[PDB]
Amino acid sequence: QNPNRFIGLM
């Protein structure tokens, strides 16, 4: 749910 988690998928 965090946008910082999307950077990890990068």
Report on this structure.
The protein is mostly loops and 10 residues long. 0% of the residues lie in helices and 0% in strands. The radius of gyration is 5 Å and the shape is elongated. It has no helices and no strands. It is classed as neuropeptide. Keywords: Helix, 3-10 Helix, Lipid induced Conformation, DPC micelles, neuropeptide.
Summarize the structure.
It is classed as neuropeptide. The protein has 10 residues and is mostly loops.
Main beta sheet strand tally, sense and closure: none
Query: What would you call the quaternary organization?
Result: monomer
Share of helix, binned: under 10%
Total number of β-strand segments? 0
Radius of gyration: 5 Å
Number of helices: 0
Shape: elongated
The class by helix and strand makeup works out as little secondary structure
Give the N-terminus to C-terminus distance in angstroms.
15 Å
PDB class: neuropeptide
Keywords: Helix, 3-10 Helix, Lipid induced Conformation, DPC micelles, neuropeptide
Assembly: monomeric
Entry title: Solution structure of NK1 agonist Phyllomedusin bound to DPC micelles
Task: Please write out the topology.
Elements: no helix or strand
PDB class: neuropeptide
Keywords: Helix, 3-10 Helix, Lipid induced Conformation, DPC micelles
Assembly: monomeric
Question: Which terms would index this structure?
Answer:
little secondary structure, 10 residues, neuropeptide
